[PDB]
RNA sequence: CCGAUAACGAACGAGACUCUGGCAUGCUAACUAGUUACGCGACCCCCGAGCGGUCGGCGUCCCCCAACUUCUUAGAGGGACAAGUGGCGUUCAGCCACCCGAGAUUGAGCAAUAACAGGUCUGUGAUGCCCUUAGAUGUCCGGGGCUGCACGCGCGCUACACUGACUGGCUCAGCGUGUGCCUACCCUACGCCGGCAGGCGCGGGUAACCCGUUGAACCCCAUUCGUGAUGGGGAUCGGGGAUUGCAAUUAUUCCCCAUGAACGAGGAAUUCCCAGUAAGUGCGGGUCAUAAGCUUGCGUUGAUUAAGUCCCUGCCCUUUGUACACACCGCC
């Protein structure tokens, strides 16, 4: 009922590898994690039955936990593999979202993994330019000077 | 129906039809002295009628030339056998047609005639035959290799607003010369009548 | 402003007035229907604004002589 | 008999200085029950100062590209700041906005290109209309500044700038800037 | 060459398709109401179609 | 003036001043109670409809941009 | 039956247009043929917008291309067959028939 | 008392948005679109809506059913439209019904306190141009 | 006292008609109501969790205005601005599967039934419960 | 234009003219436009009305089985002339203000003499000369390029946020397009499947008949957010799904989930603009197998300032000076 501040009140949470404000609301608070957006972060929220009026730091560890393991296991509890980070993995072929330093190291993977193909793509990544094959002759020049 | 097309295709078909059939008929029947084109087009039959001034020349022997016209035309656009006829009508005051008197005019040039007495005699001819005015200007490689334009105005001679739409008739020609084209425009306010 | 009449109304005017002092009157609506029969002017804005001359050189004429 | 707004008759408004009387328009047949009456007033001269002054308030509020259409949110805007200082002051309204245009509008202001010469340059009287035009003028802007980057609402900014220049307080923007321009006058006489 | 490959390539679309039916031209066609008629050559017949400039 | 760190919710010393001198001044609205209660403002909306649900505060618009409320009448 | 008759009167000038409109109502009003009114399809203005120039050089002047088709059309009604009745069109160059019967 | 064909139809237009009232002899009651005249939309131009029958007495339209029939426009021209249909209608019926002593005090009441209220605003808009973005700006020009 | 929709204030009877929807619990609802957006256009899931019940009520507001809307006339009313980014923003559809579901609910709860051209309008028993709310919305306003 | 007058009489341009907008309850008409009225209905009220309230529900050219043209369409006409009044003016040409009036400066189109070494030979089976013409500079086919980036400039789009963003409800347009000579490619209602892009069947429309009563955006009303590079902004970038095409890599386009970079109102400079105008805001057309940040139009909301000046930038007329006439970017 916006009452005074609750006792166990965590300002600072630790999910993850990362660090979240507890000031905010649940939902836009979870969307620090990397791989989480405003879309993942509110159908998690709604799979997993929580207020989404509260803020994150009034959210008591069971529910971030139960939180944190819908996140991590989205197949089992029905969202679809339409909504996911990680749909058909070029090396698995496995319908996940990955939401880490996961999420990085899968990133680096599929630049390093064009980079030794030698595509046009990991080489344009090597060369730090554009490409999504846009016109680079007047824009871009703030990462040169 | 649906097999026929919509009526604002309908028209710009007709109007497509009229401006290359006023091409062909132009280029064909330049030097006969052609001056325009009119059709009253009716679904039985269509009537497609040559404005002329040597109109004896543009019927072939016994009619040769129209009939060869007319196939072609037929042919061309595709209509059903005997369905359409070409006659031809002599231009009243030919005179006062600004386009015969461009190939008039072309055809002086062609001769030889001095552009100055050609152009001279071509606008006392007009104003003889009748006009409040005119105006022909030639242009080109007239005498040396630069350029040059001679404009010979007599007369009334309106430039601006509506009555310049239906009042002066306008015609632009090139002719080929072993130097080059020269381009000849002629203006040539008609006058009022109630007739 | 910008209300300045021209040759074409102002000898008009003049000529009718001329040629039908009689008829013509002091009537602005009077006047450009007189003016539909006693001369052909292409234009209807061309005739009114003729007939309005017409009417204030006629109100000039009834107090002194105008070139008229 | 009318209550713009629903509400605070415009009759027992009194002008205070002569010099604005024929100028600013609340009363009699400048009683309307809205703001936006749109009516040719920018078809000649001197016509907007028979346009109600309200009207001339919400005109000059939606500015800055971003809400230039829109009348209706700026006609909502007035009435809730009308709303706010009613209820801070108990007094009219229209009477707060009259007495604010009255001490906003500058009296003299500077003028002339001759090179410049001291802050302008020559001194010079500004005519009832542009004291109107600019007070209003200055009002909208000081109540956009105030409300820019800011949680306070744009009809609390505008409330607090005509309640700060009706009484005369020089803490408004709009009392600033009037008092600044009177002061390069003074230096430019 | 020969009937395999002179004109193998597909021209169901493109510029390549369309041409002026005066000039024989692929740029600046007018394809509205069914021209299929240059830039200029419109210009050229707009009286002669029925185009007038009214305003 | 570099940044408000405004309190997401209440305390002790923030509620009990707000019940006892909010309720005293003729302007109550969100903004006005946001910034003279170091609060996030809607934490304040969320407060002020508890007044008024509470019946000590008195509304006079409730629009979307705005909502204004007012001390109860002594007399 | 008994027949119904429509026929649509198309062309570019409002003048031949009333014209041929009004010899075709007249001469079914003196046959006494019930005529109903002539009805006027709202005009059909095809506009074309081009550049005045050849080259792309210039002040981009544009020209603008109008093209207006006007449409009438009328309904003949007889308690006897009325091809037979009326079969000629009295028209002029530059406007175009359409008759049509009810079933279609 | 059962007179037949009392009623008028009676236009009204702002920026291409026609308002068309029937009034008619019977009840106080005005409508729009099936809809009552409170229950509009926009009710920030409620007001403008309310402006004939705040000035002239709901006494006055006592005796009229009024149904106004608007397609066209925004939102404030279907109002404006809504509203000078209104008026319009009233006067008309005052003019073809009961005596010019009436009508003339309901006229110049309506004319005095709103112009528009009684004639239609004539302008409507203006032609786009081929060298800017609207009828009267031109696009930005650049010398180097 | 004879009372109809258009006679009250229509965004309090679209949120009493979902109120009566929610009571009278026949309202068939797809499971994936919890992930879906609205619209193409839209960047965000609607924040009330009956969304579905107030899109039904909607729906039967705009079927008794105006019938024979198909789903694509449901797209097009529900439909809005999509800002495109960057890009110069434009007008967008709504989402055709839950326009449909809608429809098919409704007409399950048999207040809409099929024309005999395409789309669908109120039956009866339709008109009847939507004046029976306007006439409890009438009556809410009235006291 | 009035007048003075060694000039008089004219011609072009301006104007006049054409289209458009504003008014006509006046005329002509309307099942491919409607409005009223009546009859069937459906729902509410029913105490009790009942000629009660709503209906874009059905009918009364499904020909004997209603009228009318206000709304819509479009023709003929009318209407505005500085015409009426007051003042100024030689009391001339005209000017200012006011009344009545829809309207007392609606926008465009057209547009003189003379000229530019302005642009186009890449619009043309317009064209002179010159070049090439079979290992072709002809033409066709395959592939690449026209996009390529240390950087500078121009037209724009999106923004920097709370006068806001998100979520939901409600609510209003006008231009105008739509199935192809060649030429293959139309606008789309409705039903079903999918979360979306889309897909699958059935129609309708060559068109005031179908899309379509164009349920447009902004705006309006409720919800959440709370002055932070934040739910502002969406650049960059990964993965997945569709559509077009013969082919999508140097990503054609579209959809979904992730990343949230600069950017906190911008120096010197500088553009456009006077009323339904600027601006906000969408929708059409052109290009289009696929497509708009462009352009051409249309509607919607809708102002601030001004009714002046020659200061800057220029323009016109007269006088004036000139060593200029390639004409001051001159000359020397
Ligand atoms: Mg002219
Ligand atoms: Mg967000």
Redesign the pocket.
């Known amino acids: 009922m916006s009452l005074v501040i609750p006792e166990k009140f965590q300002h600072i949470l630790r999910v993850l590898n990362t660090n979240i404000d507890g000031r ?2 649940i939902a ?1 608070a979870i ?1 620090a994690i ?8 509110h159908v998690v929220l709604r799979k997993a039955d929580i207020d989404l009026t509260k803020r994150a730091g009034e959210l008591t560890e069971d529910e971030v936990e139960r939180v944190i393991t819908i996140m991590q296991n989205p197949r089992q509890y029905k969202i ?1 593999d ?9 090396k698995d072929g496995k319908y996940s ?1 990955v939401l880490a330093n996961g ?1 990085d190291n ?2 680096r993977e ?1 630049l390093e993994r064009l980079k030794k193909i030698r595509a ?2 990991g080489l ?2 090597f060369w730090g ?10 824009t871009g ?2 990462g ?2 | 129906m ?1 097999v ?6 309908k028209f710009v078909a007709d109007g497509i039809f009229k401006a290359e059939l006023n091409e062909f008929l132009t280029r064909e029947l330049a030097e006969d002295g052609y001056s325009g084109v009119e059709v009253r087009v009716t679904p039985t039959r269509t009537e497609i009628i040559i404005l002329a001034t040597r109109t004896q020349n543009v019927l072939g022997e016994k009619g040769r030339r129209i009939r060869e016209l007319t196939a072609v035309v037929q042919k061309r656009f595709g209509f059903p056998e005997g369905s359409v006829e070409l006659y031809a009508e002599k231009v009243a005051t030919r005179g006062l047609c600004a386009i015969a008197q461009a190939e008039s005019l072309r055809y002086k040039l062609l001769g030889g005639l001095a552009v100055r007495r050609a152009c001279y005699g071509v606008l006392r001819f007009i104003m003889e035959s009748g006009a409040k005015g005119c105006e022909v200007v030639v242009s080109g490689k007239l005498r040396g290799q ?1 350029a040059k ?1 001679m ?1 010979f105005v007599d007369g ?9 739409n239906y009042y002066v008739d306008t015609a632009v020609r ?1 002719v ?1 010369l ?4 020269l381009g000849i425009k002629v203006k040539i306010m008609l006058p009022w009548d109630p007739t | ?8 109304v ?1 000898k008009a005017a003049r000529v009718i007035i001329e040629k039908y002092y009689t008829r013509l009157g002091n009537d ?2 009077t006047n ?1 229907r007189v003016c539909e029969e006693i001369a052909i002017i ?5 005739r ?2 003729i ?3 017409v ?2 050189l006629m ?2 004429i009834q ?2 002589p105008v ?1 008229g | 008999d009318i209550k713009l707004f629903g509400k605070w008759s415009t009759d027992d408004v009194q002008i205070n200085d002569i010099s604005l009387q024929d100028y600013i328009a609340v009363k009699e047949k400048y009683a309307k029950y809205l703001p ?1 009456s ?1 009516g ?6 001197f016509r ?1 100062a028979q346009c109600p002054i309200v009207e ?1 308030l919400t ?16 006609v ?2 007035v009435k809730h700041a009308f709303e706010i200082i009613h209820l801070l002051t108990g007094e009219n309204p229209l009477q707060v906005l009259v007495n604010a245009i009255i001490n906003s509008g500058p009296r003299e202001d500077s003028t002339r ?1 001759g090179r410049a010469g001291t802050v302008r340059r020559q001194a010079v009287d500004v005519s009832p ?2 004291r109107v ?1 600019q007070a ?2 200055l009002l ?1 802007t000081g ?2 500044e105030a ?5 306070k ?2 009809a609390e900014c505008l409330a607090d700038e005509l309640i700060n220049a009706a009484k005369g307080s020089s803490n408004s923007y709009a009392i600033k800037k009037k008092d600044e321009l009177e002061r390069v006058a003074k230096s430019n006489r | ?1 020969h009937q395999q ?11 390549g ?3 002026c ?1 005066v ?1 024989s ?1 692929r ?1 600046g ?6 021209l ?1 008629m ?1 830039r ?2 419109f210009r ?1 017949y707009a009286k002669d179609i029925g185009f007038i ?3 | 003036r570099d ?2 760190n ?1 309190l ?1 919710l209440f305390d002790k010393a923030t509620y009990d001043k707000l019940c006892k001198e909010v309720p005293n001044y003729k302007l109550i609205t ?2 006005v109670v ?1 910034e003279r209660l170091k609060i ?3 934490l304040a ?1 969320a407060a002020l409809q508890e007044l008024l649900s509470k019946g000590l505060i008195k509304l006079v618009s ?4 705005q909502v204004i409320y007012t001390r109860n009448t002594k007399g | 039956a008994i027949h119904r008759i429509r026929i ?1 009167l198309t062309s570019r000038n ?1 003048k031949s247009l ?1 014209k041929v409109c009004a010899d075709l109502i007249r001469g079914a009003k003196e046959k006494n043929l ?1 005529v ?12 074309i ?1 081009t550049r005045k ?3 792309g ?2 002040s981009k002047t ?1 020209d ?1 291309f109008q093209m207006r088709i ?2 009438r ?1 009328i309904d003949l ?1 007889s308690p006897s067959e009325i091809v037979k009745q009326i079969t000629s069109i009295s028209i002029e160059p530059g406007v175009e028939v359409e008759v049509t019967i009810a079933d279609a | ?2 007179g037949p064909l009392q ?1 008028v ?3 009204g ?1 702002k ?4 308002a ?1 009232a ?1 009034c ?1 002899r019977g009840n106080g ?1 005005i ?1 729009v ?2 809809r009552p005249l409170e229950m509009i ?4 131009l409620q007001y403008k809506l309310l402006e004939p029958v705040l000035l002239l007495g709901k006494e006055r339209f006592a005796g009229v ?1 009024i ?1 106004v ?1 608007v ?8 109002i404006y439209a809504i509203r000078q249909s209104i008026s ?1 209608a009233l006067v008309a019926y005052y003019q073809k019904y009961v005596d010019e002593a009436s009508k003339k005090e309901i006229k110049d009441i309506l004319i005095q306190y709103d112009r528009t209220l009684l ?24 010398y ?1 | ?4 929709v ?2 009250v204030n ?2 309090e009877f ?1 949120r009493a008609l979902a109120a009566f929807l929610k009571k009278s619990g026949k309202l068939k609802v797809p499971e ?1 109501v919890d992930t ?5 256009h ?3 899931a ?3 969790e009956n ?1 579905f019940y ?2 039904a009520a ?1 729906t039967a ?2 079927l008794y ?9 449901m797209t ?16 967008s ?1 709504g ?4 326009a ?1 579901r809608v ?2 609910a409704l007409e399950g709860l048999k207040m809409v039934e ?1 024309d005999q051209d ?4 109120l039956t ?1 028993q339709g ?2 419960d939507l ?2 709310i306007a ?1 409890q919305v009438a009556a809410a306003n009235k006291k």
């Open positions: 905010r609301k836009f969307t990397k791989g989480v957006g405003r879309r993942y972060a679809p339409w909504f996911l980070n990680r749909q058909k993995d070029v979202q999420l899968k990133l599929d046009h793509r344009r990544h330019l554009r490409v999504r094959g846009q016109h680079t002759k007047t020049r703030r040169r000077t | 649906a026929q097309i919509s009526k604002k295709r630069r334009s404009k009334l001679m309106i430039h601006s607003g509506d009555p310049v090139h080929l072993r130097q080059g084209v | 402003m910008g209300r300045v009449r021209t040759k074409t102002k602005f609506h450009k292409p234009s209807k804005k061309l009114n604004k007939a309005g001359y009417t204030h109100k000039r107090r002194g070139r | 936006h749109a040719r007033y920018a078809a000649k001269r907007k001339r005109n000059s509020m939606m500015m800055h590209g971003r809400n230039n259409g829109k009348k209706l949110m700026t909502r805007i290109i209309l542009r035009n209003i003028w909208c109540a956009r409300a820019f980057r800011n949680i609402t744009i | 060459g490959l002179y004109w193998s390539h597909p021209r169901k679309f493109g510029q398709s369309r041409s039916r000039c031209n740029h066609l007018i394809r509205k109401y069914g299929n240059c200029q050559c050229q400039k009214l305003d | 940044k408000l405004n997401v969100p903004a946001s996030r403002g809607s909306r409730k629009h979307r941009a | 649509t409002v009333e019930k109903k009114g002539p009805v006027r399809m709202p005009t059909k203005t095809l506009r917008t120039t050849p080259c050089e210039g544009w603008r006007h449409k059309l009604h | 008392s059962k009623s139809q009676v236009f237009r920026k291409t948005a026609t068309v029937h008619k009651l409508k679109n099936g939309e926009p009710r920030t059913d149904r029939r397609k066209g426009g925004g939102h404030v021209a279907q319009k004639v239609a605003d004539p302008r409507r808009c203006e032609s786009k141009k081929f060298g800017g973005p609207g009828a009267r700006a031109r696009y930005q020009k650049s180097r | 006292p004879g009372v109809t258009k006679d229509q965004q679209v994936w879906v957006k609205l619209a193409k839209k960047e965000l609607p924040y009330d969304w107030t899109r909607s507001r705009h205005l105006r019938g024979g809307a198909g789903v694509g006339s097009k009313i529900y439909g809005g601005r999509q800002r495109n980014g960057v890009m110069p923003s434009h007008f559809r989402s055709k599967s839950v449909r429809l098919q099929k395409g789309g669908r309008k009866p008109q009847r004046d029976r006439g």
